[PDB]
Amino acid sequence: DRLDAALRFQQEALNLRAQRQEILAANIANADTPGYQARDIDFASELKKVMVAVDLLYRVPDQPSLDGNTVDMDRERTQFADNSLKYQMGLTVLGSQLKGMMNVLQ
């Protein structure tokens, strides 16, 4: 179970990154639906709660729009790129840790 927890920290980080990526993809796909509210989650607090069933928050709008659509484009695109990069970083960290654990048994 020690191995379980030691890899569990990074596994949960990766899982939350995947969930945030899914939400970003959803609000990209629905970017032109009138009456839509941009949704996002707070990664740090969510990870803390999971380590110690996911709630999502409404993104603060930046400009008004008559059709009731508040999901911006540039901010969420930068968020998408950042989330993808951090997901890849978590993936490679987990892979390095697993390979280091494995090669000891050789």
């Binding site: 484009m73 540039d74 695109r77 930068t78 998408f80 790129a81 993808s84």
Partner: protein
């Protein structure tokens, strides 16, 4: 008074100035549309990886 008939009241100078202003404003708006479309199209490349 009888024997006379009243015509219409349209100002040719006002009509011409309005038409010119409308055409110019339409052209400016079209240029803005083109610029915004180009910017968005080139910005979407950022989404790639």
């Amino acid at each position: 008074m009888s024997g006379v008939l009243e015509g219409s009241n349209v100002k040719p100078v006002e009509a011409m100035t309005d038409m010119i202003a409308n055409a110019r404003r339409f052209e400016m708006q079209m240029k803005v549309i083109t610029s915004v479309d180009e910017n968005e199209g080139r910005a979407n490349q950022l989404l790639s990886m």
